[PDB]
């Protein structure tokens, strides 16, 4: 009995087909992804394979003006259209609180939305009861397949789930649910959740009874063979984990932004043991046509969004690289633009200026902006780069705290983690061959108590004013040292307004990669 699993994760409001960098589609002849194109491939596989399951491993929320306007009603509508078989809750599904999850998604989804390690308490327990389930038994042909859900344990730190939701250990909470499925003589069990590739591998190893793990959160790209686009594989597809009880357990993930459709075929035996498994994510490129019914429906929702593009804020003559593969691994000119804007909004009278430095987590830059659209930069383009609606605050940090933040910036370098810092008024050099915690070899900063601004070595006993996102001021992305050691905090202007005012002032921008970040 062969099962075909189709899976998506971290789609992030990429409902319309996108460019190859996951930004707004301009040259439609080379655009990719989108629900319309996804519908075609999904309906293609359903007519070829008898047993098909379409799953989503979380983080459909947040990413473009689609979620800004419809706040999740677009997710429920178009996930229903594609006839998804199950969904796991991600951390971003809570960005608008529990109420932002219950009303638009949990109450309007025609498919089960799962999470086994989320426990509701107090007044919410009655309201959110049964709107999400720890597992679901799905009939597939004349067989049944069990799907247990899990959501990041650290979700209270990543989103806004509230005080009345308890997020338990994934493994601790999954084992009882898998055992209850086995008492129901469900011998085929998929672990579908949103905790990251590293937690997916522990669930495959530690949780007895899970045959497959379908994950997300880490934007992991797995491929066996020659990859078809720019994403570099982090491992074979499927990534095989050997469990504690000796069974080979495939672990899968399909990058992000709906660019690929995960595709895995499992051959089970009569008792639900995995005989073999093979597959590879399917690049949803121009060769696959967009479904016209889904596309027409998309275009009827699109005109409510078109008022976020009428005004031109300015022009860019260069590609504004806001891609994770860039801003999370090295200096990206999108980060330099934002940090240049943050410092420019903070031009006050004290020496030469009160602030000279800026830091910005690469994980806070959520999209690039294309320059082939006549160079036009609209509020919409910016809305996808800075979709959270946070502020760019002013902070005071001892040099010691700043060095610790930059050590953290690359303490686990290589995993596309979002704590890699883009900077302004700072020249940092890393030596990755050195130990974690000892990788910053040079850290020069732009002086304030000086008549001519120049770069001087950071001194740990000194105190520096830095402009950073409020998300970092609150210890987000693991920067707890900023929250615990900062000596002063003042709240600033909205992020997208700071970047928008600057673009309007400069009229034409051309930020470059200048060497603010170097590697030894």
Ligand X SMILES: CN(Cc1ccccc1)c1nc(Cl)nc2c1ncn2CCCCCOP(=O)(O)CP(=O)(O)O
Residues within the interface to ligand X (CB under 6 A): 10, 59, 91-92, 95, 158-160, 217, 363-364, 388-390, 418, 469-471, 474, 476
Q: Is 83 in the site for Cl ion (CB under 5 A)?
A: yes
- Residue 211 touches which of ligand X, Zn ion, Cl ion, none (Cβ within 5-8 Å per kind): none
Annotated binding-site residue? 91: yes
Distance CA 363, CA 500 (A): 20
Q: 107 or 505, CB closer to its own copies? A: 505
Q: 43 or 396, CB closer to Cl ion? A: 43
CA 511 to chain centroid: 25
CB of 441 to its own copies, least distance (A): 16
Give me the residues paired with residue 144 across strands.
139
CB of 321 to its own copies, least distance (A): 5
Q: Which two tokens stand for residue 212?
A: 């497959």
Q: Is 330 in the site for Cl ion (CB under 5 A)?
A: no
Distance CA 478, CA 195 (A): 16
* Crossing angle of helices 35-48 and 292-302, rounded to 10°: 160
CB of 78 to its own copies, least distance (A): 32
- Residue 510 touches which of its own copies, Cl ion, ligand X, none (Cβ within 5-8 Å per kind): its own copies
- Residue 83 touches which of ligand X, Cl ion, its own copies, none (Cβ within 5-8 Å per kind): Cl ion
Distance CA 298, CA 414 (A): 37
Distance CA 438, CA 441 (A): 8
CB of 217 to Zn ion, least distance (A): 4
Type and span of the H or E element at 36: helix 35-48
Instruction: Decide if 21 contacts 368 (C-beta within 8 A).
Output: yes
Annotated binding-site residue? 257: no
CB of 66 to Zn ion, least distance (A): 15
Type and span of the H or E element at 97: helix 97-101
Measured CA distances, 63 to 80, 258, 368, 428, 459 (Å):
19, 12, 12, 30, 39
Q: Which two tokens stand for residue 208?
A: 């007895």
Measured CA distances, 275 to 212, 239, 449 (Å):
12, 15, 69
Q: 201 or 295, CB closer to Cl ion? A: 295
Tell me which residues touch its own copies (CB under 8 A).
317-319, 321, 333, 347, 349, 352-353, 371, 427, 446, 451-455, 505, 507-508, 510-515
CB of 472 to its own copies, least distance (A): 24
Q: Which two tokens stand for residue 34?
A: 């989108």
Matching residue, tokens 């797995």: 222
- Residue 371 touches which of Zn ion, its own copies, Cl ion, none (Cβ within 5-8 Å per kind): its own copies
- Residue 469 touches which of Zn ion, ligand X, its own copies, none (Cβ within 5-8 Å per kind): ligand X
CB of 447 to its own copies, least distance (A): 9
* Crossing angle of helices 73-81 and 35-48, rounded to 10°: 30
Q: 146 or 478, CB closer to Zn ion? A: 478
Q: 435 or 507, CB closer to its own copies? A: 507
Annotated binding-site residue? 349: no
Annotated binding-site residue? 388: yes
Instruction: Decide if 495 contacts 391 (C-beta within 8 A).
Output: yes
Binding-site annotation, residues for AMP = 328, 361, 366, 388, 471, 477
Site of interaction with Cl ion (CB under 5 A):
43, 83
């Amino acid at each position: 009995w062969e099962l075909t699993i189709l899976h998506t994760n971290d789609v992030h409001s990429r409902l319309e087909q996108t460019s190859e960098d996951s930004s707004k589609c301009v040259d439609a002849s080379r655009c990719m992804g989108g629900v319309a194109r996804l519908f075609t491939k999904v309906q293609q596989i359903r007519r070829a394979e008898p047993n098909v399951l379409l799953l989503d491993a979380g983080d459909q929320y947040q990413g473009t003006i689609w979620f800004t306007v419809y706040k999740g009603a677009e997710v429920a509508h178009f996930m229903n259209a594609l006839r998804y078989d199950a969904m796991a809750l991600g951390n971003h599904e809570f960005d608008n609180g529990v109420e932002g999850l219950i009303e638009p998604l949990l109450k309007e989804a025609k498919f089960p939305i799962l999470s086994a390690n989320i426990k509701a308490k107090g007044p919410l327990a009655s309201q959110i009861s049964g709107l999400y389930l720890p597992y679901k038994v799905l009939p597939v042909g004349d067989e049944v397949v069990g799907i247990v859900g899990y959501t990041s344990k650290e979700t209270p730190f990543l989103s806004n789930p509230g005080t009345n939701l308890v997020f338990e250990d994934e493994i601790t909470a999954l084992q009882p649910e898998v055992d209850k499925l086995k008492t129901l003589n469900v011998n085929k069990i998929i672990a579908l959740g949103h905790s990251g590739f590293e937690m997916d591998k522990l669930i495959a190893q530690k949780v007895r009874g899970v045959d497959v793990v379908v994950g997300g959160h880490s934007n992991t790209f797995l491929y066996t063979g020659n990859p078809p686009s720019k994403e570099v594989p982090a491992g074979k597809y499927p990534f095989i984990v050997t469990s504690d009880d000796g069974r080979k357990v495939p672990v899968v993930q399909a990058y992000a932004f709906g660019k690929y459709l995960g595709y895995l075929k499992i051959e089970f035996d009569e008792r639900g043991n995995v005989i073999s498994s093979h597959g590879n994510p399917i690049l949803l490129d121009s060769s696959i046509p967009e479904d016209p019914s889904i596309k027409a429906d998309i275009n009827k929702w699109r005109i409510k969004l078109d008022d976020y593009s009428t005004q031109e804020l300015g022009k860019t003559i260069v590609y504004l690289d806001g891609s994770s593969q860039s801003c999370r691994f090295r200096e990206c000119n999108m980060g330099n633009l934002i940090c240049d804007a943050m410092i420019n909004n903070n031009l006050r009278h004290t020496f030469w200026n009160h602030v000279s430095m800026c830091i910005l987590n690469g994980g806070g830059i959520r999209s690039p902006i294309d320059e082939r659209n006549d160079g036009t930069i609209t509020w919409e383009n910016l809305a996808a780069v800075l979709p959270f609606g946070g502020t760019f605050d002013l902070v005071q940090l001892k040099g010691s705290t700043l060095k610790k933040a930059f050590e953290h910036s690359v303490h686990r370098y290589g995993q596309s983690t979002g704590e890699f810092l883009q900077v302004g008024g700072i020249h940092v050099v890393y030596d990755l061959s050195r130990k974690p915690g000892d990788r910053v070899v040079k850290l020069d900063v732009l002086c304030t108590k000086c008549r001519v601004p120049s770069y001087d070595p950071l001194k740990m006993d000194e105190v520096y004013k830095v402009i950073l996102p409020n998300f970092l001021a609150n210890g987000g992305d693991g920067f707890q040292m900023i929250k615990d050691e900062l000596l002063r905090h003042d709240s600033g202007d909205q992020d997208i307004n700071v970047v928008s005012t600057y673009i309007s002032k400069m009229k034409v921008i051309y930020p470059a990669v200048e060497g603010r970040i170097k590697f030894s």
